[PDB]
Design a protein around this ligand. Structure first.
Ligand SMILES: [Zn+2]
Length: 185
């Protein structure tokens, strides 16, 4: 299924100029920001989805992630499959590794307290991460075979909730400027 969801959230810090392009394409040009997440994908995520993308521009200046991002409820969990980043490689409690789509990813868990989520501005939730051990080349078609991540997570005691919310291929940034241009399908 082609994309049906446009994610465009900023906490209000700095400038986040997001463009909802044709089909699965979008761009972001951002300046001196707080936290934001822009991307395209699906209203209802699936553990079985294969996400395709092509980042024709990946140019963070500071902390930016080029990442699958999505949520479940019951329980409320944020997950990531981070393919590239800027000045900061996100880490947490180390769980293990998974190989998928030509890369090796470290698996991490973190917790957020009093943080923004799909449920409110001040919420507490767990985050599940796969973070590639090196930045993935950009500019060619790429796949994220999410099932591989879900299955590895499960094997390390990281179960997702039962009620699936959005699932996008995102540009997330914090305290940074940059440019990105990504097509998702
Ligand atoms: Zn393992």
């Amino acid at each position: 299924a082609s994309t049906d969801y446009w994610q465009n959230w900023t906490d209000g810090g700095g400038i986040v100029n997001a463009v909802n392009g044709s089909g699965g394409n979008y761009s972001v040009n951002w300046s001196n920001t707080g936290n934001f997440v822009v991307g395209k994908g699906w209203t209802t995520g699936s553990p079985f989805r294969t996400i395709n993308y092509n980042a024709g521009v990946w140019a963070p200046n500071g902390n930016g992630y080029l990442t699958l991002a999505g949520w479940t409820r019951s329980p409320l969990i944020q997950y990531y499959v981070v393919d590239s980043w800027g000045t900061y490689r996100p880490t947490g409690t180390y769980k293990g590794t998974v190989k998928s789509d030509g890369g090796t990813y470290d698996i991490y868990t973190t917790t957020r307290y009093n943080a923004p989520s799909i449920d409110g501005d001040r919420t507490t939730f767990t985050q599940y991460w796969s973070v590639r051990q090196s930045k993935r080349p950009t500019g060619s078609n790429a796949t994220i075979t999410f099932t591989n991540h879900v299955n590895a997570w499960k094997s390390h005691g990281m179960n997702l909730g039962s009620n699936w919310a959005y699932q996008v291929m995102a540009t997330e940034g914090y305290q940074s400027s940059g440019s990105s241009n990504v097509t998702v399908w």
